[PDB]
Nucleic acid binder design. Sequence first.
DNA 1: AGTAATCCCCTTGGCGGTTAAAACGCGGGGGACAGCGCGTACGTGCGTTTAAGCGGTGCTAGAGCTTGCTACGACCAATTGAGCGGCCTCGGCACCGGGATTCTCCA
DNA 2: TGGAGAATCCCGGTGCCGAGGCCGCTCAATTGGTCGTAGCAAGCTCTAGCACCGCTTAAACGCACGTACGCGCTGTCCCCCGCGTTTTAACCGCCAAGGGGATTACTCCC
Lengths: 98, 93, 109, 439, 74, 73, 80
Amino acid sequence: KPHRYRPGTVALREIRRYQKSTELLIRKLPFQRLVREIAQDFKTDLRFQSSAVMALQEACEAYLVGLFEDTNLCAIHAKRVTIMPKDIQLARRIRGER
Amino acid sequence: RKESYSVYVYKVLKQVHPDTGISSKAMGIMNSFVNDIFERIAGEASRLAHYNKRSTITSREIQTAVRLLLPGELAKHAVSEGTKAVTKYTSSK
Amino acid sequence: RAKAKSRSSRAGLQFPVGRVHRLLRKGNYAERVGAGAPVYLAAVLEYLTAEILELAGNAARDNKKTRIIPRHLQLAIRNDEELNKLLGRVTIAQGGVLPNIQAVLLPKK
Amino acid sequence: QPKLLNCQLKEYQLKGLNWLVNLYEQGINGILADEMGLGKTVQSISVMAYLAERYDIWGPFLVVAPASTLHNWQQEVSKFVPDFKVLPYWGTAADRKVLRKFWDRKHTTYKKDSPFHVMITSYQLVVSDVAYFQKMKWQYMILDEAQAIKSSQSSRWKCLLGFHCRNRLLLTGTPIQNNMQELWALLHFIMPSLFDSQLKRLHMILKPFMLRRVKKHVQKELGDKIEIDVFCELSYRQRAMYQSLRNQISIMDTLMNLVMQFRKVCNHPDLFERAPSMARFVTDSGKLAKLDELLRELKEGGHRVLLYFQMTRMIDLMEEYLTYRNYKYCRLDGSTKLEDRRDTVADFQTRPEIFIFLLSTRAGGLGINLTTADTVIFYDSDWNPTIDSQAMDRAHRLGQTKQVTVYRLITRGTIEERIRKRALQKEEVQRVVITGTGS
Amino acid sequence: LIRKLPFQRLVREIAQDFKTDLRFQSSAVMALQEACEAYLVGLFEDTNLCAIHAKRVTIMPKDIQLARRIRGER
Amino acid sequence: VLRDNIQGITKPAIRRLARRGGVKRISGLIYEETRGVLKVFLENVIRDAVTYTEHAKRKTVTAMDVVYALKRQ
Amino acid sequence: RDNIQGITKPAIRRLARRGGVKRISGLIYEETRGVLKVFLENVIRDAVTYTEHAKRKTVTAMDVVYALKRQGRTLYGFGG
DNA sequence: AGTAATCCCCTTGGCGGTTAAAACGCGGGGGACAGCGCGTACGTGCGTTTAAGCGGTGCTAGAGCTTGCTACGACCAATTGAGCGGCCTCGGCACCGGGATTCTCCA
DNA sequence: TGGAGAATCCCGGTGCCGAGGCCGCTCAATTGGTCGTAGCAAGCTCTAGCACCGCTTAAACGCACGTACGCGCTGTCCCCCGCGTTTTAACCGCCAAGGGGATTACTCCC
Ligand SMILES: Nc1ncnc2c1ncn2[C@@H]1O[C@H](COP(=O)(O)OP(=O)(O)O)[C@@H](O)[C@H]1O
Ligand code: ALF
Ligand SMILES: [Mg+2]
């Protein structure tokens, strides 16, 4: 029989890994292509500096990491340990994005 | 020819922590921090002059700006540092 | 033609009272810039730079590092209540986050 | 002569070395203005090898060339002194940064151990890296085809003027070019203490500062440039366009536009707007018809041909025509990278299966050998006559294997007439302003 | 909604910390009151969503604290 | 000196403000929590409004000083 | 094209770990992709507006930083 | 003074591989969620009393505006040295490996 | 309580690349004098902010009391986690291209 950590144990071990670190968590090349797509939707035959798509990635990831915190507090404010779409929808409505 | 605060940041760093270095990316955030707070103060000083109908950005404008933009204890310590720097610029030339 | 000594040296500052005078003019914040206004501002810019780097040098020392890193700036800025209030809408490149796990998430007995 | 050369100088080149040495030892500058193909790139090496063997100067020597010539220098310098140490300062910025590591400032005269004696670079690099070319001092400078300097308003004149160089030598094909102030820029460059800012007196004051031998007196085995100004004729499509475009002159009062727009359709109407078949494409240009006929006659003759174009888009259209027929070819224009220039010139010179070389007038005209061609066709002509002369003498050159012939595809009745007439005038004027060996 | 006189006295009481014997223009009080009522109304909205999200209908102090925490007021 | 005037925003007033926010039912602990919210807000408005007042060396706080304090929120 | 699907499930997981989240409904992932692109659809259009109004045919790092700063998300490190 | 060629540089695109990250399958566990019972805590209504609101009176602090001038900043030309771009190097930090200590889970 | 084993830490070694200091120079900060004006100063006007009184009645408070709703408990089931397998595309490097921006040449027009 294999040894097995319980459900939720490695979620905590992962939290302690992605907190306490600074690496970018979205893969570089996929984010570039999404940015180029959204750029095409606004102005064709644009170009981007490397530091422009880096600057744009850093702002996005910080926005999503900071958003999840507010949804975790919504989840934890209900009885739940699990975040659900209605927590994002409440968080963004309290923030005033929604 | 670009211009940077890096040499002035180093000469503050080597005062507060003469042993301690700074990485270029950290120095970049120091440039961004100085630029952002310089412009935030000057922006309020502009508005304080504008509100008063005055053509001059005095040290009085920057004092009232500093007491608006900074938290209560950073405000008082900064106002202290600023008021003595001017008081030693005055009584020189 | 006397031997020039910088307006910073006379004010007693590292930060450049000259650039702060020019930049207060180039930005056209107002028509006229007082003589002491660049001095007062250059002193506050120098002071706040020391506040950041004092706490960040401590945090660098805690990490057993000789050299300050964007991580240490974030830790300093968020640990100090007033820097955190001064920068509560600023994202720092490669700052990361504070280690913070909500109490309910830690395992039961 | 310096035994370091591992080569003989020719008779005329040895007197040329003596002149160049005399100017150096007397502390004065001059122009080596020998006719194209007589060997100025060799006399330039001989004086460095003398400064090595006679005085152990061993550099630093700066050698500034047009970009397509830079491999001609790199190779021939290595030939005419096997022991010289050559720095090839060209490439991307990162490559030049790696090359610049060898610019020792600390010795103003280089030891024979120094990592170079001679440095070859582009007329664009000396202006692009000027801040690095300043903060340096040169024992000698060659400007390898100095008619590039002839505009005193050019930055490459303003910059190279002040490089802190103890002596300077210009090589040129014919220095007189458009006029006399455009000569003074070359004279001021070498001797700004003397010249600062009647046509009988010049011959007696340029003589100390110029040497100007000519290929009737030198290399007599290079039989004359047989030439056929063809005076071919428009075709129906071109003349419909030409008349519709010449009508614009009647409406006018814009030749600054139209002379190009006229010469575009003089070359091929598909440059203006494209037609679907080779029968139309060959025959709807009077030039391309007469060219295709002549190329057939030449290929049956076993000739190998250089075609010069003024418009690079015509090198594309000609390259369609060539690929739609049986002809193996090379291309060399100002869009090519320098290694492509090196190899295509070497490829053409390697093997006689290649029929035709397409060359742009300027990028392909200036200064590297094509001595296994035998026929030169100006499909279009340079409106400065001197540049067509350099192009002709890339074939008509020392080592030229066979009797050269030259063709020029003048379209009768077009704006092409004005251009070759005025080139004919200007080459006459240029022989008013010079005739005589110099020294 | 708030009674005018006890808001004036609240304003006076608060202001006395910063400068003794300030004066307040009558319009300046209303500009503070109309901002405070609008701020409290707009916060109770955000708390009511927190209650409704936690399946309560009765708003509770942890709803105010969650509203402010997400608005960044704390 | 004045004191305890934060009890001048009564509990019915907090009801009206909550009902205007759509609240159906109100915990009895809200009423003191609302005062800890209003006080921390109204302090940091008036701090700026007075800082704008005294800069012009005046003594009445004007509606313009309030507007500039709110504009700093 | 749908490079929004290139914001994969593990990446959204990693971001939620840094956000301190223990357990994630599988419905969160498609919600998070919708939220991310609505962010990018505002920052890039302002960053492009800067490049267009300043008459350049490339987008620089500082165009983004002005675009962020103008929407209240000041970024230090990329100029700024 | 114009327009076209030439040449630099820097961004985009493609090709190959290699391996690290994403996707997929599957058991089970424990957390989401509906259901239940109670009890206490909030909404309602009434009688009480408290002071907010209004109309009216009185005073003076000080907001707001004009006059007069000189102290202070704008403007220019000559001087110079503080600050930037380029080049070099060695030491700090990362990355690895291997044994030591810690923590988690089923017994 | 123990134990096994995975996961996290530590200690020393390796090496590489970026931090810290040096060098040349330019151009931006400083010195010196001029000149205009604005805002600091003294002075008048009267607005409106503060204070007090007295009345009215609508708003606030204390209390009774019913029942609507918050909260801990119980049961279930479904669905997201932990771990092995399969596979795909992100990363790296190297070559091409093209494009654009600066410069240079030559002619026509003024
Ligand atoms: N003395 C010589 N011995 C052998 N070859 C020579 C000599 N002089 C010139 N050549 C050849 O003449 C050819 C063209 O000479 P070059 O100097 O390049 O002409 P240009 O005057 O246009 O530079 C070169 O290939 C060179 O090898
Ligand atoms: F001197 Al030449 F082509 F004539 F290089
Ligand atoms: Mg030559």
